[PDB]
Design a protein around this ligand. Structure first.
Ligand SMILES: CCNC(=O)c1c[nH]nn1
Ligand SMILES: [Cl-]
Ligand SMILES: [Mg+2]
Ligand SMILES: [Mg+2]
Ligand SMILES: [Mg+2]
Ligand SMILES: [Mg+2]
Lengths: 194, 194
């Protein structure tokens, strides 16, 4: 019933562009939408985000998160490890790779979502959410070695899965960070379950 | 350590703008980023809300109430939590209840309200409050819920059981071209993981 008629370029950066989308509304009237797209997509999706479950015997199961300065936000954010999928990379391989670079952990793939939208009223950005388990008792994850690329500066924050929401709220209150909406959504559902 | 040095406007549509962001990296070196912002944020503590609406009815399993609509940035239909921007002077809770009623017909009760969470913080400064609302589906008000969509709004309601949310989402993606939102998928994944 609704569909895109045309896309007009408004402005194109190196990494992001702004378009004016013309579309057919369900009444049969033509309407416009200002949209954002990345210039980097090739791929199943733009990026991956990793839900890393750190499993150590005789310890609570932790979710491994990252804290970074985010220039669009003007501040620090707490997020699932994540990055864009390299040209001709699978989402799983991007997931294990980004997890290693950002955290130093070597994980195993548990499951992989279909491409999911980030902010669909604003952009076409999509990611695969990849659930990964980390055997924290293996020697490779003893002294995990994070390999930041140029200009990446990432802090690792592991939080217990069984209290995640309350721990995130604490960091927000105490550290004036912004929690990521996907992280928060995950944390809410852990409390809402059953 | 890191902070914004300058924000230069590149292009300003009516709804969105693109900015060249200059910031100080933690080595003391000046770097740039291409940033997206909305033009609509005034004194709201966030751009928008998204509502987690838990529909509760005697002798029923709890449902999560979702909406499906065409998203011109995505060029297709998306399944999302009910959501909208916060009107000037409106509280996040009022916005949540109002959007829920407009989009679904249901009259909810506030349960909890998150702090401002970021939508896609490597791309944009956009933020939302995630507002959990219970819907008493045994109340007469909520028996024959009719969407009251605004101008150019065309929303379908999809209520799915909480106890099978992920598989029911998978079954919808399997049967048609449609993208699930990353917050909804994250929430459904945690419901499984718990
Ligand atoms: C910022 C994403 N664009 C919009 O919200 C919009 C609304 N009408 N036209 N474009
Ligand atoms: Cl798991
Ligand atoms: Mg990253
Ligand atoms: Mg990277
Ligand atoms: Mg909406
Ligand atoms: Mg609306």
């Amino acid at each position: 019933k609704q569909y895109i008629i045309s896309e007009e370029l408004i402005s194109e950066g190196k990494w992001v562009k702004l378009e004016k989308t013309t579309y057919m509304d369900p009444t049969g009237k033509t309407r416009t939408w200002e949209s954002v797209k990345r210039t980097t997509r090739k791929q199943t999706a733009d990026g991956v985000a990793v839900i890393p479950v750190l499993q150590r015997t005789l310890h609570y199961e932790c979710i491994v998160l990252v804290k970074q300065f985010r220039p669009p936000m003007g501040g620090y954010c707490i997020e699932f490890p994540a990055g864009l999928i390299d040209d001709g990379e699978t989402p799983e391989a991007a997931a294990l790779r980004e997890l290693e670079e950002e955290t130093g952990y070597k994980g195993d793939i548990a499951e992989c979502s279909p491409a999911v939208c980030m902010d669909p009223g604003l952009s076409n950005c999509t990611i695969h959410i990849v659930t990964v388990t980390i055997n924290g008792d293996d020697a490779e994850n003893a002294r995990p070695k994070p390999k930041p690329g140029d200009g990446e500066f990432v802090e690792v924050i592991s939080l217990p899965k069984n209290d995640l929401l309350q721990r995130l709220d604490a960091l927000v209150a105490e550290e004036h960070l912004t929690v990521d909406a996907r992280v928060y959504s995950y944390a809410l559902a852990l409390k809402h379950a059953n």
